Amino acid sequence: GPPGPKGDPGPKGDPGPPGARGQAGVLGFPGPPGPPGPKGDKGDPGGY
Amino acid sequence: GPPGPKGDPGPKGDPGPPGARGQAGVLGFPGPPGPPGPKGDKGDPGGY
Amino acid sequence: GPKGPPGDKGPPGDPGPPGARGEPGNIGFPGPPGPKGPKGDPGDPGGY
């Protein structure tokens, strides 16, 4: 008998794999300066 | 005789490509404050 | 009659899902030392 017709196109492929993780973020800014030190000791008493 | 059956569906397509890279990470938090400065200089001496 | 020939290969899949966001950047360095404390007061003059 006559051959049957050609089949239909194959199915669409599966989705691709998940993407790679993003790069790590940029390093934070340095902290602020510390406080001033304490005030120095009073100078020597004057002589009499 | 009668016709043959329609052919089978074609082979499945290729998988897609990998997804896009994820977003870059958030910036680090700032560092902590620095230490205190040293204690100040002793004062100048008193006079007589 | 004989079964027909198969269909052609299907079309390709979609790109995959996006990657995860990157990790945060490192915490920044500790801040610089604060300034030296104020100099001490001068000594007072001696008594009589």
Short mmCIF file of N, CA, C and O in Angstrom, two decimals:
data_model
loop_
_atom_site.label_atom_id
_atom_site.label_comp_id
_atom_site.label_asym_id
_atom_site.label_seq_id
_atom_site.Cartn_x
_atom_site.Cartn_y
_atom_site.Cartn_z
N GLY A 1 0.83 -1.18 0.00
CA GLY A 1 0.00 0.00 0.00
C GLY A 1 0.87 1.24 0.00
O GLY A 1 2.08 1.17 0.15
N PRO A 2 0.26 2.41 -0.10
CA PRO A 2 1.01 3.65 -0.04
C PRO A 2 1.63 3.83 1.34
O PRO A 2 1.03 3.49 2.36
N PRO A 3 2.84 4.37 1.40
CA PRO A 3 3.43 4.69 2.70
C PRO A 3 2.60 5.73 3.43
O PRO A 3 1.96 6.60 2.82
N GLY A 4 2.64 5.66 4.75
CA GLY A 4 2.01 6.67 5.54
C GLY A 4 2.74 8.01 5.45
O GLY A 4 3.90 8.09 5.02
N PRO A 5 2.09 9.07 5.87
CA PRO A 5 2.76 10.38 5.86
C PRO A 5 3.88 10.46 6.89
O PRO A 5 3.92 9.72 7.87
N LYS A 6 4.73 11.47 6.71
CA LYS A 6 5.82 11.71 7.64
C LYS A 6 5.26 12.17 8.97
O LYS A 6 4.24 12.87 9.03
N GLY A 7 5.96 11.80 10.03
CA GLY A 7 5.59 12.19 11.37
C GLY A 7 5.75 13.67 11.65
O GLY A 7 6.36 14.40 10.89
N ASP A 8 5.18 14.05 12.77
CA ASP A 8 5.21 15.42 13.21
C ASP A 8 6.55 15.75 13.88
O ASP A 8 7.26 14.87 14.37
N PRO A 9 6.87 17.03 13.97
CA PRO A 9 8.14 17.44 14.59
C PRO A 9 8.21 16.94 16.00
O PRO A 9 7.20 16.85 16.71
N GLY A 10 9.44 16.67 16.40
CA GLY A 10 9.75 16.23 17.73
C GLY A 10 9.43 17.30 18.74
O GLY A 10 9.24 18.49 18.43
N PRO A 11 9.36 16.90 20.00
CA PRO A 11 9.01 17.86 21.04
C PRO A 11 10.13 18.85 21.32
O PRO A 11 11.31 18.60 21.08
N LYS A 12 9.71 20.02 21.75
CA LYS A 12 10.66 21.04 22.24
C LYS A 12 11.53 20.47 23.35
O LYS A 12 11.10 19.69 24.21
N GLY A 13 12.76 20.89 23.35
CA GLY A 13 13.70 20.48 24.37
C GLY A 13 13.34 20.97 25.76
O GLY A 13 12.52 21.87 25.95
N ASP A 14 14.00 20.37 26.74
CA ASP A 14 13.85 20.78 28.12
C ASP A 14 14.58 22.11 28.38
O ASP A 14 15.50 22.50 27.67
N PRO A 15 14.15 22.85 29.39
CA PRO A 15 14.91 24.05 29.76
C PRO A 15 16.36 23.74 30.10
O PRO A 15 16.69 22.67 30.61
N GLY A 16 17.22 24.73 29.89
CA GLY A 16 18.61 24.60 30.24
C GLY A 16 18.83 24.62 31.74
O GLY A 16 17.89 24.86 32.53
N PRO A 17 20.05 24.31 32.18
CA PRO A 17 20.32 24.23 33.60
C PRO A 17 20.27 25.60 34.26
O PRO A 17 20.39 26.64 33.61
N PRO A 18 20.13 25.63 35.57
CA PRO A 18 20.15 26.92 36.28
C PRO A 18 21.47 27.68 36.08
O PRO A 18 22.53 27.09 35.94
N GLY A 19 21.37 29.01 36.06
CA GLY A 19 22.53 29.86 35.95
C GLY A 19 23.43 29.76 37.16
O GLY A 19 23.06 29.29 38.23
N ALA A 20 24.64 30.26 36.96
CA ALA A 20 25.66 30.30 37.99
C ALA A 20 25.33 31.38 39.01
O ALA A 20 24.71 32.41 38.71
N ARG A 21 25.83 31.18 40.21
CA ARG A 21 25.63 32.16 41.27
C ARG A 21 26.36 33.45 40.93
O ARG A 21 27.43 33.47 40.32
N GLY A 22 25.75 34.56 41.33
CA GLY A 22 26.39 35.85 41.16
C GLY A 22 27.70 35.97 41.92
O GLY A 22 27.97 35.24 42.87
N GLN A 23 28.52 36.89 41.46
CA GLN A 23 29.78 37.19 42.15
C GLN A 23 29.53 37.70 43.55
O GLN A 23 28.52 38.35 43.81
N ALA A 24 30.49 37.47 44.45
CA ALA A 24 30.44 38.06 45.78
C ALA A 24 30.47 39.57 45.66
O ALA A 24 31.05 40.14 44.73
N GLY A 25 29.81 40.23 46.59
CA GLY A 25 29.77 41.68 46.59
C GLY A 25 31.10 42.34 46.88
O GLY A 25 32.07 41.69 47.28
N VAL A 26 31.14 43.67 46.73
CA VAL A 26 32.33 44.47 47.03
C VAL A 26 32.54 44.58 48.54
O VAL A 26 31.61 44.50 49.34
N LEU A 27 33.80 44.73 48.91
CA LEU A 27 34.18 44.82 50.32
C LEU A 27 33.68 46.11 50.90
O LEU A 27 33.61 47.18 50.23
N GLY A 28 33.24 46.04 52.15
CA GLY A 28 32.72 47.23 52.80
C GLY A 28 33.75 48.33 53.01
O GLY A 28 34.95 48.10 52.99
N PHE A 29 33.24 49.54 53.25
CA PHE A 29 34.12 50.68 53.54
C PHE A 29 34.81 50.41 54.89
O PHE A 29 34.27 49.76 55.78
N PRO A 30 36.00 50.99 55.10
CA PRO A 30 36.58 51.01 56.44
C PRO A 30 35.67 51.63 57.46
O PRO A 30 34.85 52.51 57.12
N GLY A 31 35.76 51.19 58.70
CA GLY A 31 35.04 51.84 59.76
C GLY A 31 35.47 53.26 60.01
O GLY A 31 36.45 53.75 59.48
N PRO A 32 34.71 53.96 60.83
CA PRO A 32 35.06 55.32 61.20
C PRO A 32 36.24 55.34 62.13
O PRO A 32 36.58 54.33 62.77
N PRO A 33 36.85 56.52 62.34
CA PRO A 33 37.92 56.60 63.33
C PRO A 33 37.40 56.36 64.73
O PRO A 33 36.23 56.57 65.05
N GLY A 34 38.31 55.88 65.58
CA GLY A 34 38.06 55.80 66.99
C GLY A 34 37.99 57.17 67.63
O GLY A 34 38.23 58.22 67.00
N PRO A 35 37.71 57.17 68.94
CA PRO A 35 37.60 58.43 69.67
C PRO A 35 38.97 59.00 69.98
O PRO A 35 40.01 58.31 69.91
N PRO A 36 39.01 60.25 70.37
CA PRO A 36 40.26 60.80 70.89
C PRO A 36 40.71 60.03 72.12
O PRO A 36 39.90 59.52 72.90
N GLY A 37 42.02 60.02 72.35
CA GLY A 37 42.55 59.53 73.59
C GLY A 37 42.17 60.43 74.74
O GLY A 37 41.69 61.56 74.57
N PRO A 38 42.43 59.97 75.96
CA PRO A 38 42.19 60.82 77.12
C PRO A 38 43.18 61.96 77.20
O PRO A 38 44.24 61.96 76.60
N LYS A 39 42.78 62.99 77.93
CA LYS A 39 43.65 64.15 78.14
C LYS A 39 44.89 63.78 78.92
O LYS A 39 44.87 62.92 79.79
N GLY A 40 45.99 64.44 78.56
CA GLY A 40 47.23 64.18 79.25
C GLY A 40 47.24 64.65 80.70
O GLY A 40 46.40 65.43 81.16
N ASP A 41 48.24 64.19 81.43
CA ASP A 41 48.45 64.58 82.81
C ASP A 41 48.85 66.06 82.90
O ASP A 41 49.49 66.60 82.01
N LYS A 42 48.47 66.70 83.99
CA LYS A 42 48.85 68.07 84.23
C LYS A 42 50.37 68.17 84.35
O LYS A 42 51.06 67.26 84.83
N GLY A 43 50.92 69.29 83.91
CA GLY A 43 52.34 69.51 84.02
C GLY A 43 52.82 69.66 85.44
O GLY A 43 52.05 69.79 86.38
N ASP A 44 54.14 69.61 85.59
CA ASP A 44 54.75 69.65 86.89
C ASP A 44 54.36 70.93 87.63
O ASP A 44 54.37 72.03 87.05
N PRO A 45 54.13 70.84 88.93
CA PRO A 45 53.97 72.06 89.73
C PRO A 45 55.20 72.94 89.61
O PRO A 45 56.32 72.46 89.57
N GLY A 46 54.99 74.24 89.66
CA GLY A 46 56.11 75.14 89.67
C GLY A 46 56.85 75.11 91.00
O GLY A 46 56.32 74.74 92.05
N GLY A 47 58.11 75.48 90.96
CA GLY A 47 58.89 75.63 92.17
C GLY A 47 58.41 76.78 93.04
O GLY A 47 57.61 77.65 92.65
N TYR A 48 58.85 76.74 94.28
CA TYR A 48 58.40 77.71 95.23
C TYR A 48 59.20 79.00 95.11
O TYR A 48 58.63 80.13 95.05
N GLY B 1 -3.40 -2.17 -0.97
CA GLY B 1 -4.07 -2.07 0.34
C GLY B 1 -4.17 -0.65 0.82
O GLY B 1 -3.76 0.28 0.13
N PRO B 2 -4.68 -0.47 2.02
CA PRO B 2 -4.77 0.85 2.56
C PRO B 2 -3.41 1.40 2.90
O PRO B 2 -2.39 0.71 2.99
N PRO B 3 -3.36 2.69 3.16
CA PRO B 3 -2.08 3.34 3.52
C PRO B 3 -1.50 2.83 4.83
O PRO B 3 -2.22 2.39 5.72
N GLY B 4 -0.19 2.98 4.96
CA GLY B 4 0.49 2.77 6.21
C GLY B 4 0.18 3.87 7.18
O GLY B 4 -0.30 4.94 6.80
N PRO B 5 0.47 3.63 8.45
CA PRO B 5 0.28 4.68 9.46
C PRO B 5 1.24 5.86 9.28
O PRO B 5 2.32 5.76 8.71
N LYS B 6 0.81 7.01 9.80
CA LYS B 6 1.69 8.17 9.92
C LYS B 6 2.93 7.82 10.73
O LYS B 6 2.89 7.00 11.66
N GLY B 7 4.05 8.40 10.33
CA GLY B 7 5.29 8.20 11.05
C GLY B 7 5.23 8.70 12.49
O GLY B 7 4.37 9.48 12.91
N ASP B 8 6.23 8.25 13.24
CA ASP B 8 6.37 8.62 14.63
C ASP B 8 6.85 10.07 14.74
O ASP B 8 7.46 10.62 13.82
N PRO B 9 6.63 10.70 15.89
CA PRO B 9 7.16 12.06 16.08
C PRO B 9 8.68 12.04 16.03
O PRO B 9 9.32 11.02 16.31
N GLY B 10 9.26 13.19 15.68
CA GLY B 10 10.70 13.29 15.58
C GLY B 10 11.37 13.24 16.93
O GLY B 10 10.69 13.25 17.97
N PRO B 11 12.72 13.17 16.94
CA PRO B 11 13.46 13.22 18.21
C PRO B 11 13.31 14.55 18.90
O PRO B 11 13.03 15.60 18.30
N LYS B 12 13.46 14.50 20.20
CA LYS B 12 13.31 15.69 21.00
C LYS B 12 14.45 16.68 20.75
O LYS B 12 15.59 16.31 20.48
N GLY B 13 14.12 17.96 20.92
CA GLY B 13 15.09 19.01 20.68
C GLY B 13 16.16 19.08 21.77
O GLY B 13 16.05 18.49 22.83
N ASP B 14 17.18 19.87 21.48
CA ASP B 14 18.26 20.05 22.44
C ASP B 14 17.74 20.75 23.70
O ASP B 14 16.82 21.58 23.63
N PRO B 15 18.34 20.51 24.88
CA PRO B 15 18.05 21.36 26.05
C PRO B 15 18.51 22.77 25.77
O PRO B 15 19.44 22.98 24.97
N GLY B 16 17.89 23.74 26.44
CA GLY B 16 18.31 25.11 26.35
C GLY B 16 19.67 25.32 26.97
O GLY B 16 20.21 24.47 27.68
N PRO B 17 20.18 26.52 26.81
CA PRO B 17 21.46 26.85 27.41
C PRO B 17 21.29 27.14 28.89
O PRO B 17 20.16 27.33 29.36
N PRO B 18 22.39 27.20 29.64
CA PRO B 18 22.30 27.64 31.04
C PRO B 18 21.62 28.99 31.19
O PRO B 18 21.68 29.85 30.32
N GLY B 19 20.98 29.17 32.32
CA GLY B 19 20.43 30.47 32.66
C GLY B 19 21.49 31.54 32.84
O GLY B 19 22.69 31.30 32.91
N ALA B 20 21.00 32.79 32.99
CA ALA B 20 21.85 33.94 33.23
C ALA B 20 22.49 33.87 34.61
O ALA B 20 21.93 33.29 35.54
N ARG B 21 23.65 34.50 34.74
CA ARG B 21 24.30 34.56 36.03
C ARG B 21 23.41 35.34 37.00
O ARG B 21 22.75 36.31 36.62
N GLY B 22 23.43 34.93 38.26
CA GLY B 22 22.73 35.67 39.27
C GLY B 22 23.32 37.06 39.50
O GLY B 22 24.42 37.38 39.07
N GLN B 23 22.53 37.90 40.17
CA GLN B 23 22.93 39.26 40.49
C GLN B 23 24.16 39.22 41.40
O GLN B 23 24.32 38.33 42.25
N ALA B 24 25.03 40.22 41.27
CA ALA B 24 26.17 40.35 42.18
C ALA B 24 25.68 40.57 43.60
O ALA B 24 24.61 41.15 43.84
N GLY B 25 26.48 40.11 44.55
CA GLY B 25 26.15 40.26 45.95
C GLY B 25 26.11 41.71 46.40
O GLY B 25 26.71 42.59 45.78
N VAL B 26 25.42 41.91 47.51
CA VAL B 26 25.36 43.19 48.18
C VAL B 26 26.76 43.54 48.74
O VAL B 26 27.55 42.70 49.13
N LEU B 27 27.04 44.83 48.82
CA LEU B 27 28.30 45.32 49.45
C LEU B 27 28.37 44.97 50.92
O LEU B 27 27.37 44.98 51.63
N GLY B 28 29.57 44.61 51.37
CA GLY B 28 29.78 44.35 52.78
C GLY B 28 29.40 45.52 53.67
O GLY B 28 29.53 46.65 53.26
N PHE B 29 29.02 45.24 54.90
CA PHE B 29 28.80 46.28 55.86
C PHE B 29 30.15 46.98 56.19
O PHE B 29 31.23 46.42 56.01
N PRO B 30 30.09 48.22 56.66
CA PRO B 30 31.32 48.90 57.12
C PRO B 30 32.00 48.20 58.24
O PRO B 30 31.37 47.48 59.04
N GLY B 31 33.30 48.40 58.34
CA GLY B 31 34.04 47.91 59.47
C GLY B 31 33.67 48.63 60.74
O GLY B 31 33.02 49.68 60.72
N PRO B 32 34.08 48.06 61.85
CA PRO B 32 33.84 48.69 63.13
C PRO B 32 34.73 49.90 63.33
O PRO B 32 35.72 50.10 62.61
N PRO B 33 34.37 50.79 64.26
CA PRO B 33 35.24 51.94 64.55
C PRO B 33 36.64 51.52 65.01
O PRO B 33 36.87 50.44 65.58
N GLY B 34 37.58 52.42 64.80
CA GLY B 34 38.93 52.21 65.22
C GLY B 34 39.12 52.37 66.71
O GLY B 34 38.21 52.72 67.44
N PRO B 35 40.33 52.10 67.18
CA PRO B 35 40.63 52.25 68.60
C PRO B 35 40.77 53.70 68.99
O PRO B 35 41.01 54.57 68.14
N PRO B 36 40.72 54.00 70.29
CA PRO B 36 41.07 55.35 70.75
C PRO B 36 42.49 55.70 70.37
O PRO B 36 43.38 54.85 70.34
N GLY B 37 42.74 57.00 70.21
CA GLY B 37 44.10 57.50 70.18
C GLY B 37 44.78 57.33 71.51
O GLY B 37 44.14 57.03 72.50
N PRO B 38 46.10 57.48 71.56
CA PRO B 38 46.81 57.40 72.84
C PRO B 38 46.47 58.60 73.73
O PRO B 38 46.01 59.65 73.27
N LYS B 39 46.77 58.42 75.01
CA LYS B 39 46.65 59.49 75.98
C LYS B 39 47.52 60.67 75.57
O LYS B 39 48.62 60.51 75.07
N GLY B 40 47.01 61.87 75.83
CA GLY B 40 47.72 63.08 75.45
C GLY B 40 49.04 63.25 76.16
O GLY B 40 49.35 62.62 77.18
N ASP B 41 49.83 64.16 75.61
CA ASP B 41 51.11 64.49 76.20
C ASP B 41 50.92 65.12 77.57
O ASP B 41 49.96 65.86 77.80
N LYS B 42 51.85 64.84 78.48
CA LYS B 42 51.87 65.56 79.73
C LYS B 42 52.02 67.06 79.47
O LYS B 42 52.72 67.49 78.56
N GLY B 43 51.38 67.85 80.29
CA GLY B 43 51.46 69.30 80.16
C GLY B 43 52.85 69.87 80.42
O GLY B 43 53.73 69.25 81.01
N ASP B 44 52.99 71.14 80.05
CA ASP B 44 54.22 71.88 80.28
C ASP B 44 54.38 72.22 81.77
O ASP B 44 53.40 72.31 82.50
N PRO B 45 55.61 72.40 82.24
CA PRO B 45 55.82 72.66 83.67
C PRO B 45 55.37 74.06 84.08
O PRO B 45 55.36 75.01 83.30
N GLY B 46 54.97 74.17 85.34
CA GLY B 46 54.70 75.46 85.93
C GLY B 46 55.96 76.24 86.26
O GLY B 46 57.04 75.68 86.39
N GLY B 47 55.82 77.55 86.40
CA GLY B 47 56.95 78.38 86.78
C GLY B 47 57.00 78.66 88.27
O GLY B 47 56.12 78.27 89.04
N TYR B 48 58.06 79.36 88.68
CA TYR B 48 58.31 79.59 90.09
C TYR B 48 57.21 80.45 90.69
O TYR B 48 56.83 80.29 91.89
N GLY C 1 0.10 -0.51 3.49
CA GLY C 1 1.38 0.12 3.26
C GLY C 1 2.23 0.29 4.49
O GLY C 1 1.79 -0.01 5.60
N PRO C 2 3.48 0.69 4.28
CA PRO C 2 4.42 0.83 5.39
C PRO C 2 4.21 2.12 6.17
O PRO C 2 3.73 3.11 5.64
N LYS C 3 4.64 2.10 7.42
CA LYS C 3 4.56 3.29 8.27
C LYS C 3 5.44 4.36 7.65
O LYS C 3 6.51 4.09 7.10
N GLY C 4 5.00 5.61 7.76
CA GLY C 4 5.78 6.73 7.26
C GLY C 4 7.03 7.00 8.05
O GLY C 4 7.21 6.51 9.15
N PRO C 5 7.92 7.83 7.50
CA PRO C 5 9.17 8.17 8.21
C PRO C 5 8.87 9.09 9.37
O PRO C 5 7.83 9.77 9.40
N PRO C 6 9.77 9.14 10.33
CA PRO C 6 9.53 9.97 11.51
C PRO C 6 9.66 11.46 11.20
O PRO C 6 10.24 11.90 10.20
N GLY C 7 9.11 12.26 12.09
CA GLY C 7 9.32 13.69 12.00
C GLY C 7 10.76 14.09 12.27
O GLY C 7 11.62 13.31 12.68
N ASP C 8 11.01 15.38 12.11
CA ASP C 8 12.33 15.91 12.36
C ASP C 8 12.53 16.23 13.84
O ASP C 8 11.58 16.25 14.64
N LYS C 9 13.78 16.44 14.18
CA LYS C 9 14.13 16.84 15.54
C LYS C 9 13.41 18.12 15.95
O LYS C 9 13.25 19.06 15.18
N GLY C 10 12.98 18.12 17.19
CA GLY C 10 12.27 19.26 17.74
C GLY C 10 13.14 20.48 17.96
O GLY C 10 14.38 20.43 17.85
N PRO C 11 12.51 21.58 18.36
CA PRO C 11 13.24 22.81 18.55
C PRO C 11 13.91 22.83 19.91
O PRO C 11 13.55 22.07 20.81
N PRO C 12 14.88 23.70 20.11
CA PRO C 12 15.63 23.68 21.37
C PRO C 12 14.82 24.29 22.52
O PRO C 12 13.91 25.09 22.35
N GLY C 13 15.21 23.89 23.72
CA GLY C 13 14.57 24.38 24.92
C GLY C 13 14.91 25.80 25.27
O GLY C 13 15.82 26.44 24.73
N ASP C 14 14.19 26.28 26.29
CA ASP C 14 14.41 27.61 26.79
C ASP C 14 15.71 27.69 27.58
O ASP C 14 16.15 26.72 28.17
N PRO C 15 16.30 28.90 27.71
CA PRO C 15 17.39 29.08 28.67
C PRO C 15 16.86 28.76 30.05
O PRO C 15 15.67 28.95 30.36
N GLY C 16 17.77 28.33 30.91
CA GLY C 16 17.39 27.95 32.22
C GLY C 16 17.08 29.13 33.12
O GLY C 16 17.14 30.32 32.73
N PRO C 17 16.71 28.82 34.34
CA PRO C 17 16.39 29.85 35.31
C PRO C 17 17.64 30.61 35.74
O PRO C 17 18.77 30.11 35.64
N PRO C 18 17.50 31.82 36.24
CA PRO C 18 18.67 32.60 36.64
C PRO C 18 19.35 32.03 37.88
O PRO C 18 18.73 31.40 38.73
N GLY C 19 20.65 32.31 38.01
CA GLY C 19 21.38 31.90 39.19
C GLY C 19 20.96 32.70 40.40
O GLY C 19 20.33 33.74 40.31
N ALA C 20 21.36 32.19 41.55
CA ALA C 20 21.15 32.86 42.82
C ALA C 20 22.02 34.11 42.93
O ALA C 20 23.10 34.21 42.34
N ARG C 21 21.55 35.07 43.72
CA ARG C 21 22.36 36.24 44.01
C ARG C 21 23.65 35.85 44.73
O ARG C 21 23.69 34.89 45.51
N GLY C 22 24.72 36.57 44.43
CA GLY C 22 25.97 36.35 45.12
C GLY C 22 25.91 36.66 46.60
O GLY C 22 25.04 37.38 47.09
N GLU C 23 26.88 36.12 47.32
CA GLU C 23 26.99 36.40 48.75
C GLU C 23 27.46 37.83 48.99
O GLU C 23 28.07 38.49 48.13
N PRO C 24 27.21 38.33 50.18
CA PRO C 24 27.66 39.67 50.44
C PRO C 24 29.14 39.83 50.42
O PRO C 24 29.90 38.91 50.72
N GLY C 25 29.55 41.04 50.13
CA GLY C 25 30.94 41.38 50.25
C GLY C 25 31.40 41.27 51.68
O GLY C 25 30.57 41.32 52.59
N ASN C 26 32.71 41.13 51.91
CA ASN C 26 33.20 41.09 53.28
C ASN C 26 32.96 42.40 54.00
O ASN C 26 32.94 43.47 53.41
N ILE C 27 32.85 42.28 55.33
CA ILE C 27 32.79 43.45 56.18
C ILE C 27 34.06 44.25 56.00
O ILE C 27 35.15 43.69 55.87
N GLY C 28 33.96 45.57 56.05
CA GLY C 28 35.11 46.40 55.82
C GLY C 28 36.11 46.33 56.98
O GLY C 28 35.82 45.81 58.07
N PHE C 29 37.30 46.83 56.71
CA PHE C 29 38.33 46.85 57.72
C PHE C 29 37.96 47.73 58.89
O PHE C 29 37.24 48.72 58.74
N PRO C 30 38.49 47.42 60.08
CA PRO C 30 38.36 48.35 61.18
C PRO C 30 38.87 49.72 60.85
O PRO C 30 39.85 49.90 60.12
N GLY C 31 38.23 50.76 61.40
CA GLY C 31 38.60 52.13 61.15
C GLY C 31 39.96 52.48 61.74
O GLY C 31 40.53 51.76 62.56
N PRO C 32 40.44 53.67 61.41
CA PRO C 32 41.74 54.10 61.91
C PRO C 32 41.67 54.56 63.35
O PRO C 32 40.59 54.87 63.87
N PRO C 33 42.79 54.59 64.04
CA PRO C 33 42.79 55.12 65.41
C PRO C 33 42.30 56.56 65.46
O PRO C 33 42.49 57.34 64.53
N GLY C 34 41.68 56.91 66.56
CA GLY C 34 41.35 58.27 66.81
C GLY C 34 42.58 59.09 67.10
O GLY C 34 43.71 58.57 67.23
N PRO C 35 42.41 60.39 67.21
CA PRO C 35 43.56 61.25 67.44
C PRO C 35 44.10 61.11 68.86
O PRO C 35 43.39 60.71 69.77
N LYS C 36 45.38 61.44 69.02
CA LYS C 36 45.95 61.57 70.35
C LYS C 36 45.08 62.51 71.19
O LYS C 36 44.54 63.50 70.68
N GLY C 37 44.95 62.19 72.46
CA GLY C 37 44.21 63.04 73.35
C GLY C 37 44.81 64.42 73.50
O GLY C 37 45.96 64.68 73.16
N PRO C 38 44.01 65.34 74.02
CA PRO C 38 44.49 66.70 74.23
C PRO C 38 45.65 66.71 75.20
O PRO C 38 45.70 65.95 76.17
N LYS C 39 46.59 67.63 74.96
CA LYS C 39 47.73 67.78 75.83
C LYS C 39 47.25 68.23 77.20
O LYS C 39 46.26 68.98 77.33
N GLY C 40 47.96 67.78 78.24
CA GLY C 40 47.61 68.20 79.57
C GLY C 40 47.74 69.69 79.77
O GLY C 40 48.46 70.40 79.09
N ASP C 41 47.08 70.13 80.84
CA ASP C 41 47.19 71.50 81.24
C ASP C 41 48.59 71.78 81.75
O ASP C 41 49.25 70.89 82.32
N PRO C 42 49.07 73.02 81.60
CA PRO C 42 50.36 73.35 82.21
C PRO C 42 50.28 73.28 83.73
O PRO C 42 49.23 73.48 84.33
N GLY C 43 51.41 73.00 84.36
CA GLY C 43 51.44 73.09 85.81
C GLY C 43 51.18 74.50 86.29
O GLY C 43 51.42 75.49 85.61
N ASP C 44 50.71 74.61 87.52
CA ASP C 44 50.49 75.93 88.08
C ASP C 44 51.74 76.45 88.74
O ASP C 44 52.61 75.69 89.18
N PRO C 45 51.84 77.76 88.90
CA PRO C 45 53.02 78.33 89.55
C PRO C 45 53.09 77.93 91.01
O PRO C 45 52.07 77.70 91.66
N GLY C 46 54.31 77.86 91.53
CA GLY C 46 54.49 77.52 92.93
C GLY C 46 54.07 78.66 93.84
O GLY C 46 54.11 79.84 93.46
N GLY C 47 53.68 78.30 95.06
CA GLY C 47 53.27 79.26 96.05
C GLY C 47 54.43 79.95 96.75
O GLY C 47 55.61 79.64 96.55
N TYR C 48 54.07 80.93 97.59
CA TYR C 48 55.04 81.70 98.36
C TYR C 48 54.80 81.50 99.86
O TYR C 48 55.58 81.95 100.69
#
